Homo-oligomer: A and B are copies of this chain.
Amino acid sequence: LKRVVWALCFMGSLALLALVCTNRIQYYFLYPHVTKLDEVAATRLTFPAVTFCNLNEFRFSRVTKNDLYHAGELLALLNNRYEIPDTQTADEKQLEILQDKANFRNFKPKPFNMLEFYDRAGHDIREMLLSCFFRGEQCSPEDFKVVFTRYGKCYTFNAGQDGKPRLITMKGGTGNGLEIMLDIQQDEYLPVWGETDETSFEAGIKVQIHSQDEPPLIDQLGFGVAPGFQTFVSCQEQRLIYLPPPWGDCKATTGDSEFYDTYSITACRIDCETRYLVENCNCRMVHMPGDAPYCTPEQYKECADPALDFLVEKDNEYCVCEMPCNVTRYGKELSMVKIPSKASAKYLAKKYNKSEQYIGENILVLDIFFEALNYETIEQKKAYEVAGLLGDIGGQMGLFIGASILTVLELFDYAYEV
């Protein structure tokens, strides 16, 4: 009778060992991870890269007759027949100027390049930048690097490219960061006389705070800043460490692109777009990097734009961009105050030779800074390693039947002898 109770106890114990062991094994092959959040104080923080664009792509006073000829349809200033659209709400002077530039009688077309057009007709930072301050000391427009995006000629402060060393901040708070007073030059905006898809009613700038290791993607990752306010941006540096397969989904390999030195998801997207447009239309857009020839406005109309839209719509499988394992993100909180005060309106108007109306509707102040001298870390950590797996299997294997790998080897010994 005792051998029966022993047989039942050994059988049930071996069954429990079976299901528990297969449980821990399956849990290991899920490759599970859990997250470790930490806050690290630092004596210094590397200030990020700040890219800003004017919402107006190009200045009206800088557009020329040749520009209307080649890119008149693309710039939406002229209709398909090289004639001005509906004149509703058209200033007499502006409409006469445009009508004069669109005469096109005995006109010899000069050579035209999209990057030349954006570079000269775009808003000059030397005119927009009314004042610059970093850590309380003056900055020059030479700190701003020209970057071409979908919005046109844009500028990146502290880009850290072309061998310039990146700036640091040793104190947090509103004073100890970037602080620029900009004039968005609303007088230079393209007149809107007729409704169009490209017609926009916004006035202000668009800013993206990003690491120097990634290029700007201002059309998607930027936030707007409106004239007439001083906007504060409190930043919190975040350092992210992800896990590669089979734990998570990250880009383990450096994967350097021909266009960009360091791999970033932004660089992967704009690289994918660049390759697609170069293959499909044999030309490259203004914002894209490389050595390819830039598109002509005819190529823009008949190939480039429908090609990108078709790439977005047809299938995401062509452009699948994984996230790198080491990522520096910047968190940001926005707040506003009014500019200028009644005590300063006259002084600003006289300082920049403008009317107080103009100052009120054209001046914005951007204040970008770190809230405090610390950074957060978010790390994906492996939850079950092979040492822990063997430890649990050994513990339960020793608890239920008290056997070992040598014991199973001995049972296989008798099986081979049998």
Contacts and interface: CB of A to CB of B under 8 A. Distances in A.
A219 B367 CA distance: 13
Nearest to A381: B34
A402 B392 contact: no
A248 interface: yes
Interface string A261-275: 000000000000000
A402 B395 contact: no
Nearest to A402: B404
B391 A395 contact: yes
A243 to B, nearest CB: 9
Interface string A333-358: 11111111111101111110000000
Contact of A173 (B205, B220, B228, B406): B220
B399 A401 contact: no
Contacts of A321: 41
Interface residues of A, number: 129
A283 to B, nearest CB: 22
Contacts of A380: 37-38
A369 to B, nearest CB: 9
A394 B24 CA distance: 14
A253 interface: no
Nearest to A312: B171
Contacts of A337: 55, 202-206, 224-226
Contacts of A189: 341-344
Copies of this chain, complex-wide, total: 3
B344 A201 contact: yes
A142 B38 CA distance: 40
A81 interface: no
A375 interface: no
Interface in A345-391: 346-351, 361, 365, 371-372, 378, 380-381, 383, 385-388, 390-391
Contact of A36 (B35, B170, B202, B388): B35
A402 B398 contact: yes
Interface string A387-415: 11011111111111111111101000100
Contact of A174 (B220, B381, B413): B220
Contacts of A381: 32, 34, 383
B38 A248 contact: yes
A9 interface: yes
B195 A338 contact: no
A329 to B, nearest CB: 10
A143 interface: no
A221 interface: yes
Interface string A109-126: 000000000000000000
Top 10 nearest A-B pairs (CB, nearest first) are A394-B399, A395-B395, A391-B392, A394-B395, A173-B220, A402-B404, A43-B316, A204-B337, A223-B335, A203-B341
Interface of A: 2, 6, 9-10, 13, 20-21, 23-24, 27, 32-41, 43-44, 55-56, 88-89, 91, 136, 170-175, 181, 186-187, 189-195, 197, 199-206, 219-230, 232, 234, 242, 248-249, 312-313, 316-317, 320-323, 332-344, 346-351, 361, 365, 371-372, 378, 380-381, 383, 385-388, 390-407, 409, 413
27 contacts: A20-B390, A24-B387, A27-B387, A35-B35, A39-B323, A44-B316, A88-B347, A170-B312, A187-B342, A189-B341, A191-B343, A192-B343, A200-B344, A201-B340, A202-B340, A202-B365, A203-B342, A204-B338, A221-B372, A223-B232, A225-B335, A334-B334, A388-B392, A390-B399, A394-B394, A400-B404, A402-B407
